[PDB]
Structure formats: C-alpha cells, structure tokens
Amino acid sequence: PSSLIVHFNEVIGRGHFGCVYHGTLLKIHCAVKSGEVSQFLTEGIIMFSHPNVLSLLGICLPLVVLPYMKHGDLRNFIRNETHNPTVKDLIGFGLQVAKGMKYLASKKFVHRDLAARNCMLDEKFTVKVADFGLARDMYDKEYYPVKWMALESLQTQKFTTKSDVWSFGVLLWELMTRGAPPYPDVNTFDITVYLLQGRRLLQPEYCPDPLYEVMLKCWHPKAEMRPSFSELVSRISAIFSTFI
Ligand SMILES: Cc1ccc(-c2ccc3c(C)n[nH]c3c2)c2c1[C@H](N(C)C(=O)c1ncccc1C(F)F)CCC2
C-alpha cells in the first residue's frame, strides 16, 4: 500500500519488455508492471520460488512487482566486449540454469523457449530463468525459435521436459561461444532436413571435451534417453569443480 515507490516516467530496458517501470520496494530496487500474464507469476500467487528462477516479489493494490536484474539478457552480457567472463564463470552460468530448470521440471512445468536471451543476470552475478508467456504447467500429463527446438517438437508440435533438455544443450553452446548464433548458414525452414542429415552443432574453441559430450547427450535422437536436469546438475558440478 505505502511500501511501493513507482517511477512511471522511467521504464526498464528501453521498452524491450513493454511498459515495465523502475520501482523501490520497502530499499529494494525492483521492476513494476500494471490473466494473459506469465504462468510462473500466477503460480507464485496461488501456489513456487527458486534462486535461479525469475519470480514474483509481490502484488500491490494492480501492480505486479518482480526483482530488478542489472543485466536483462544473458546473451547480451556474454556478447558485450567490456565483460570478460572466464570458462569457469560461463560453465557456472549454465549450472545455475540447470538448477532453475531442475526445480521447474519438479513442478511439472515446460519452458518451451529456453535460450540465453531469456535468462537474466543481477549485480551479484546470479542467473535467473525468465518466462515471457510460453511456459506451461503440464499438471498430471507428461507433455504439453526453431534452432533451439528438439527434433521431435519440430515434427509434432509437442513439448516435454526432454525437449527443454535439448534446448539446454544449445544454451550451453551459446555460453561456450559467448553469444554466437547457432547454425549461422542454415535457414529456419530446412532445420529438420539439416538435422536428419546426421548433424549437430560443432564443438566450440574453449568448450572442454567433457562439456561437449554433455551437449551431445542433450541432443540424443531419443528423448527418453536424454539426461534429466538432476543428472545435468550432477555432471556439470563435477566439470566446474575441475577449474580453479
Ligand atoms: C509482469 C512482468 C513484470 C516485470 C518483468 C521484468 C522485466 C524485465 C526485468 C529486468 C531487466 N529486471 N527485472 C525485470 C522484470 C516481466 C514481467 C513479464 N510479463 C510481461 C508478464 O508476465 C506478462 N504480463 C502481462 C501480459 C503478458 C505477460 C507475459 F506473459 F507475456 C514476465 C517477465 C518480464
């Protein structure tokens, strides 16, 4: 009621997220917006919270308040030449995404657009998985940006947690290339054809061999054979621990 100062003359991220304003919650910096909303927000009201997931701070009377993220796009952050993240930091960012995804999958939620441009970074360098309206609760069922999509989703329009695992592999690839575009010489229509030819993304220059074998496991032709986000958190923790 009297615990929110809202700056209606100051929008976050130059309009790239719509009308979202700078706020101060009683002093915490925040993002303020005024049923079509993200399902993670409706879950945080009715049900749901994780440090690696961008979620609701609260509701004010309506005013939907989320926390402020200094770097609203992880893809932009790793692509900016003023930042020089190490191979250990980039693997660390991926481990955080896998932690948020392991949590969301336990909640039976399917993201459907897991990419580095849909992850945010704050001032303490903590990564959060954001949803812009595409994630769905799968409830009791086990199913519900073509270059990040799994082969069985391109062919059938059905999404499962294992199709998110495929996208996580492309996110890992984006991380090791510091924001390079996947399949740069391929058109989005012939992606299914390009893949069915027996192809996958090439191993980047600074991607350690054990991390590339993990990306290949994520892109396994059979969805049921892909590792879970628990196995990915386990496997990536070990690789990360080998670096000083
Ligand atoms: C409501 C809201 C408040 C703050 C943000 C935000 C943005 C940037 C930053 C940054 C850079 N830091 N913190 C931030 C917070 C966002 C939302 C978003 N959103 C618009 C909705 O859920 C939504 N609302 C109405 C209609 C449809 C939808 C959606 F489903 F399409 C979800 C993620 C972005």
Domain boundaries, the chain: 4-67, 74-241
The tokens of 118 are what? 């849909």
Decide: 55 and 40 in contact? Cβ < 8 Å: yes
The tokens of 129 are what? 């998985």
Q: Residue 23 pairs with which residues in a beta bridge?
A: 6, 30
Method used to determine the 3D structure: X-ray
CA distance readout (Å), 8 to 21, 25, 57: 6, 14, 19
Going from the Cα of 137 to the center of ligand 1, the distance in angstroms, rounded, reads: 18
* Per-residue 3-state assignment (H helix, E strand, C coil) for the chain: CCCEEEEEEEEHHHHCCCCEEEEEECCEEEEEECCCCCHHHHHHHHCCCCCCECCCCEEECCEEEEECCCECCHHHHHHCCCCCCCHHHHHHHHHHHHHHHHHHHHCCEECCCCCHHHEEECCCCCEEECCCCCCEECCCCCCCCHHHCCHHHHHHCCCCHHHHHHHHHHHHHHHHCCCCCCCCCCCHHHHHHHHHCCCCCCCCCCCCHHHHHHHHHHCCCCHHHCCCHHHHHHHHHHHHHCCC
End-to-end, the C-alpha distance of the chain in Å comes to 48
Measured by CA distance, the residue closest to atom 32 of ligand 1 is: 132
Decide: 148 and 167 in contact? Cβ < 8 Å: yes
Catalytic residue among 113, 122, 131, 137: 113
Q: Which residues of 188-207 are buried (b: 16+ CB within 10 A; e: fewer)?
A: eeebeeebeeeeebebbeeb
Put residue 180 in one of left, alpha, beta given phi > 0 → left and psi -120 to 50 → alpha: beta
Ligand 1 pocket mutation, candidates 37, 69, 109, criterion most atoms within 8 A of CB: 37
Alpha-carbon gap, residue 184 to 127, rounded angstroms? 26
Going from the Cα of 16 to the center of ligand 1, the distance in angstroms, rounded, reads: 10
Which fold, 4-67? Phosphorylase Kinase; domain 1 (3.30.200)
Measured in angstroms, the resolution is 2.4
**What kind of architecture, by CATH, is found in domain 74-241?**
Orthogonal Bundle (1.10)
Beta-carbon count within 10 A of 170 CB: 23
Nearest to 108 by CA among 132, 135, 129: 135
> Which residues line the annotated binding site?
12-20, 33
Measured by CA distance, the residue closest to atom 1 of ligand 1 is: 33
Look up 190 and say whether it is catalytic: no
Decide: 240 and 95 in contact? Cβ < 8 Å: yes
Question: 112: which residues sit within 8 A by CB, 6+ positions away?
Answer: 134, 135, 136, 144, 159, 163, 164
Question: 164: which residues sit within 8 A by CB, 6+ positions away?
Answer: 101, 105, 110, 111, 112, 114, 229
Going from the Cα of 17 to the center of ligand 1, the distance in angstroms, rounded, reads: 7
Alpha-carbon gap, residue 74 to 21, rounded angstroms? 20
Measured by CA distance, the residue closest to atom 33 of ligand 1 is: 132
Beta-carbon count within 10 A of 25 CB: 18
Beta strand pairing call for 28-33 and 63-67: antiparallel
* Ligand 1 binding site (Cβ under 6 Å of any ligand atom): 12-13, 17-18, 20, 31, 33, 36-38, 41, 64, 66, 68-69, 72, 120, 130, 132-133
The tokens of 39 are what? 């399902």
Alpha-carbon gap, residue 244 to 240, rounded angstroms? 9
